Symmetry: D2
Subunit: 331 residues, 4 copies
Amino acid sequence: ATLKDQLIYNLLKEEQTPQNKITVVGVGAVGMACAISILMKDLADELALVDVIEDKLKGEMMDLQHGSLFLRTPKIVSGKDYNVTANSKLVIITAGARQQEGESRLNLVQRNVNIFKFIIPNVVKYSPNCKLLIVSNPVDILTYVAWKISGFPKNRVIGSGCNLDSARFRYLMGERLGVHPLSCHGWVLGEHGDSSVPVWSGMNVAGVSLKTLHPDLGTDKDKEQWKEVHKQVVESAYEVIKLKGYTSWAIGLSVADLAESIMKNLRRVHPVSTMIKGLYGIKDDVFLSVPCILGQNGISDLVKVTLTSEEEARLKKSADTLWGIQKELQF
Amino acid sequence: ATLKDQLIYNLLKEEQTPQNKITVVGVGAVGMACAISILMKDLADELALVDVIEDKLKGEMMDLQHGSLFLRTPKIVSGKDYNVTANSKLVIITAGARQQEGESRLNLVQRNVNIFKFIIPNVVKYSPNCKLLIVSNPVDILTYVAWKISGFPKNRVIGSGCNLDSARFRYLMGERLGVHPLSCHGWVLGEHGDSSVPVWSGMNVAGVSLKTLHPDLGTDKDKEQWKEVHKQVVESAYEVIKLKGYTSWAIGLSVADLAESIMKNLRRVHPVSTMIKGLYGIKDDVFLSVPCILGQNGISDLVKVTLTSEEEARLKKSADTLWGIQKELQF
Amino acid sequence: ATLKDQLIYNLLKEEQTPQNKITVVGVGAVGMACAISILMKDLADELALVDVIEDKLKGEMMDLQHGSLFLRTPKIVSGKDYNVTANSKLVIITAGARQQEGESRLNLVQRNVNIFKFIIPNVVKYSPNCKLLIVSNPVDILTYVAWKISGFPKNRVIGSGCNLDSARFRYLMGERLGVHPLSCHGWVLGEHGDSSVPVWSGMNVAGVSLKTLHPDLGTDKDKEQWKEVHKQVVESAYEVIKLKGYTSWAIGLSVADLAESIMKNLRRVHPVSTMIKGLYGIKDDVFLSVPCILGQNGISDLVKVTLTSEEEARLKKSADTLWGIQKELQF
Amino acid sequence: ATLKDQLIYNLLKEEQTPQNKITVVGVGAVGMACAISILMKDLADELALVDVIEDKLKGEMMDLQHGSLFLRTPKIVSGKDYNVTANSKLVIITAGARQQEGESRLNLVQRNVNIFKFIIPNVVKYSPNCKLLIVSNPVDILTYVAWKISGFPKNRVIGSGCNLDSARFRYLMGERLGVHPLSCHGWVLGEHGDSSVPVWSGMNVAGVSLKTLHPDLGTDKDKEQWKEVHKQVVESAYEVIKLKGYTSWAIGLSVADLAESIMKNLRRVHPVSTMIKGLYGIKDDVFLSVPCILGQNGISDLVKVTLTSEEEARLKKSADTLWGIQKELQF
């Protein structure tokens, strides 16, 4: 018969079903940075890409496939049809609009809510037991939207949130102190956006509180202008957008970071978007970033961070901003 | 005193001189795919990016920097000035014009030769002992150009060549046979382009010659049309370009593959562009892809592949095509 | 009330099915080398160790646990009771007697068959859908034993076989040729032991047949004495045993190599102990090493290597030796 | 012509000089756990092993070499002669006596000081610009000894110190809290031994001070008995020794962790043995563990941790114990 038959004696065949499948919805720069990052961290036995643009989708899939020799993910598939998404453990949504230069993420809300009305039911149809990781902006509101639409328990709907903001924060912290970001600790919580809250009280190296060493830290009076580090965090996205048109690599790595914790059930702590109703006097169904324990069931636990009254005030302000938009939605 | 000084007592100033520095010239899609791939394989203690477009360059650098928390490359720098490139072990050139839909890589020659006249002397100025890895197209001619311009010994000028073509070939081989590409062996040699030569005689799984099993393999008579696999290899770049506008991920991974062998002195065998004068009756200073041993001195050795008379004829044809263009290059 | 409760909320409690669990039976040098190798390749979300020596077992578990900060396997458990083994994807058997200086692996047969009569039913009880990877010696016979005892289909019973022999072979090949073993190809098949068969016909670098270049390769007349490379393969175990008392690291890495292909469903080709009946005129239920495709269902396929009449004669001889012992087996 | 010449055409001859060489002195369980850990983290282009026991040494080398197929370290060498050590970037000393069950590490001092009088000058002879990483016990005193003997600047003499103690601490912290150790923060400083100091003030998850949440933390009055976590840290080594005869895996991983920071110039913070004269009112040349910034020049910086008066008292006590022994040392 065939060359294959001359060479290989077959015992089995289909031997099917993926055990560790990840789907990325959206093959824009963000989606593909998530894809490459996940492929190179060996988090998946199958990667599925979905988009509406069929030419781009096939091209992206093929480009990844041509590099298969150098990867350890044996199955890469794509399709407009969500059936390619079946039995995903983790589905990452990166599809939607995306802010231009000067544009608030909050300005994307109605466009991307409409998109989610199509995407989320289709994802859920084919992977009912998946975790949903929302990356599309505004991520905090859209996490809430994905939660309402999907009907999933809240532990299985995670927004990428301030994982990236905190990463940026720690990078800049490290630059100032001459320490690798890995050894620089500090949390940016709340909205992934303009109303993010830097937790000065928590900033530390080797367990040494920076606010203790330097009480002016985070105030306007601060001779060292540490408040500017947070300002740079807020402005990062806009500045990168200004310079190169979009952001991709940082968010990609950030998402693979979250994927790693979920897929490997690490129970690491990440600042990600989740429902915070009942904390810090928030009474509504607001989603924003707090430190959460991430594992194979998604968010199993929240860390109840202690905030200064001002830090708490800023977080309540973030909550209000978000709830203001959320309440007007048809989810 | 500053917070840094309050917190940290310094013994030593200046983390002086990079030990494992890689430079990527060109921050187009290819350059940045090389960058991310190298960053995630931990091949460098310092990554430098260089381009002429200053806004894009700074934006790319910053995007990578924001993800520092998730990498183990502590220093990422960029600049128009080649002084950011100093003391590189490996310099990867991805700058230049790239082919549009329908356009032969050979059509880029004069534009990219002009570019290389600027780039190569600047690279050499700041990293005289580096290895040059040429990725810009047409890679085989431009490797020769980089060799002439740099004045480097031929072992330190390497073209990415058919590393990717072979990777694609093995992917497709694997698809047909139901085997991981890692276990599918087969070489595409010669021009990284239309005149590439698939070495049917060398195609094997588990040491079993496929041509032995199936003598029609590679010919027009072949009922199974294995020739079409090489068909797909030649046309890959064009089809991906057609679908998504460019290729990035596969070439990126391919380049990191080569970088890994160089940086870690693996002495693995890769089909890369090098001078083949004196082999297969080629008498001119032609560069094309043959299997080479890659390590910390670049190409230390060539494998002298045995070719069928036809396979050799195809390689001589590839050589002629390339030499035809090479001879005209007064640059 | 507790600090844990003050700090950490809880959305989701009971949970607890492992998705990617590996069990290692036997915490001798081999077992623990398998354990460390698997832990550092991130192949498992849970590692279980089982042995009969309770003090040693607990000590080993604890030592690994103390290094948890530096691993990505969140759950390490041990116990005499096989209930710690439940829901393993892959169970690696390394328990039993091992050969002393001068002792043939075939001399371990009755002792280890008796051991397997206890081990295998217990493994199967708690992980009925696992793949069994047999490492205990003589691995080829004991793979057959594990197959008979377990009642598993033959695809889910894999002996580590000649994966290590081939690895050694390629190392030595590489030493002689000045090439990384990764780029040196050559298969040692049959018994993991004295009657192993080096497939000279398949030995190649970059697809170039070494036997073609050097027809004396593998014969006694060979001026270069390539036969000695195989002799060194056969004698490796004995020489290492002579020098340090046992072998551990190489077999450990070899086993993690196989585990990687199984867990990640790579469909890579490895020379491992399996069913062979119906190939090369073998008519009995002999298990020995041939190149097999390894994935999430274990051995899905065998590669039908072409052998010289002598290579085939040697493999039939290996088969006879093994069958001679197998037929006499006392369960 | 030889087979080598038929197969390989040579461009380049001598090749050589290691760029990223690591030496491990001592091939006891600790030495070899360091070796395997380093080999699997790809930290070295060359690994050298040295010991006095020639049979064991050769056996260990060979066992690692046989697994070369599965590693990316192309050169593994061993020898009694320290010339195999030449041009190491990092030399890890694990040779010497180790403690028995119930035996204080401080009881090893004179035996291992004598050993160091031979080892250290030989290491320095062949790798004058290396970093010395001392693992032999008592590590704090022996770091001081290696510093005095070598004549190196203090930044290039590093004791593994409390990197492991802190790792154990964080593991146990994580066990109690249901969080991965990576997300559990807490430092054990001072002597790697009975007089280690747990920094209760610094213990945190997600930046939330545990002592703030639970003021009894670390006291005897503590209902939750967190003091027992530290007691378990002190007793770990002894309990593992009691159970399996020695410790290997945890210290191995801990050492590779430090090696990673040094080789890749990460500037991560690790609690390692260094000279602390001038801190916490210590006036003598005492070495003990404080958080240090680790990179390619070794210890570039110390973090000046803020301690409670009691925590500081405990550290001064640790310092006194160590200085008591150090002052008596003769050369």
